[PDB]
Amino acid sequence: NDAVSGQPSIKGQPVLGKDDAPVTVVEFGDYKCPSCKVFNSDIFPKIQKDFIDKGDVKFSFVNVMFHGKGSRLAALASEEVWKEDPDSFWDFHEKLFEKQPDTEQEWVTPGLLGDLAKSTTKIKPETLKENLDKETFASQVEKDSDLNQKMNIQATPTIYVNDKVIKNFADYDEIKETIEKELKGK
């Protein structure tokens, strides 16, 4: 039906922000999703400036694989970057979204993901690409899928503010108000 209320676990997930931040914002997203591209460019930076920078919010991203083989490739790459060079993760993440074209045909390839690793992280392109071929990080993508299913994710992006499901990811008023209400409660 709809995404389930409740606090998703961010254990093992990429995180940005202070450990002790009182509000956790989680995005369930897909690198091939055009609405996730919009969230990344239009909404995410506002949450950063307003909340993450000042230690109010810690942010996490969980992979959802709604757009076929390219979604899976992208997710495997994302997992590897978090594990091997987490300090660079959010730079790689933002560039993969910036790379998403405004066309519907498959665009995700190992060469593409290898080039991003080279520009944004300390990870070797050939290493990343070898791991994509072997699907070295498949267990982490499956863990993400398990979590997606547990929360009954129906569309991407789905944003959680603590245990609250945001109705419209593109409505910064809703997001900001919900963050602020959770801060109060805290």
Side-chain angles (χ1 to χ4, degrees):
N1 188 347
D2 286 335
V4 326
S5 291
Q7 172 67 243
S9 169
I10 63 167
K11 186 161 281 186
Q13 305 293 345
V15 288
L16 178 67
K18 298 333 148 310
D19 310 311
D20 58 339
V23 177
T24 299
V25 173
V26 183
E27 171 183 5
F28 287 87
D30 180 337
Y31 289 106
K32 285 189 70 187
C33 171
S35 285
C36 296
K37 183 186 177 86
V38 170
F39 180 80
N40 179 78
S41 63
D42 292 5
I43 305 292
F44 187 36
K46 303 185 173 208
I47 299 170
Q48 294 178 208
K49 300 278 152 279
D50 289 341
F51 300 107
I52 302 182
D53 286 344
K54 72 185 274 190
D56 284 337
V57 164
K58 56 167 71 177
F59 179 89
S60 186
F61 178 83
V62 178
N63 277 279
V64 184
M65 285 174 27
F66 280 174
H67 304 261
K69 52 186 191 81
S71 290
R72 182 171 174 76
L73 263 199
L76 293 163
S78 184
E79 290 305 325
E80 173 171 357
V81 175
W82 178 246
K83 179 65 174 164
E84 301 177 346
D85 189 20
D87 282 352
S88 298
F89 174 81
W90 296 98
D91 295 315
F92 172 91
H93 180 81
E94 277 134 73
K95 297 317 195 212
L96 181 45
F97 272 117
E98 285 167 52
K99 291 283 185 183
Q100 179 196 295
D102 297 321
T103 67
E104 190 184 343
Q105 302 308 324
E106 189 54 81
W107 59 276
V108 187
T109 65
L112 186 150
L113 300 158
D115 285 328
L116 288 184
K118 195 198 184 59
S119 52
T120 58
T121 78
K122 291 188 316 182
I123 301 169
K124 287 185 180 185
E126 63 268 22
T127 296
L128 177 71
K129 287 199 294 191
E130 166 172 26
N131 285 320
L132 295 169
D133 193 49
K134 301 179 311 175
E135 293 192 308
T136 301
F137 291 92
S139 81
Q140 300 292 315
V141 179
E142 297 304 335
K143 155 179 179 198
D144 283 13
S145 297
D146 288 330
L147 182 54
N148 297 160
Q149 297 182 249
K150 177 180 187 71
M151 310 305 296
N152 201 219
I153 305 302
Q154 304 297 123
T156 51
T158 297
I159 310 303
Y160 281 72
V161 178
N162 288 342
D163 62 344
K164 307 307 190 297
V165 183
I166 294 297
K167 292 182 307 299
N168 181 6
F169 71 92
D171 183 350
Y172 189 53
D173 177 63
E174 184 192 356
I175 292 167
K176 190 175 202 280
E177 291 176 7
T178 303
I179 287 301
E180 290 162 347
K181 190 158 182 170
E182 289 298 309
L183 281 169
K184 193 70 68 188
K186 290 302 173 198

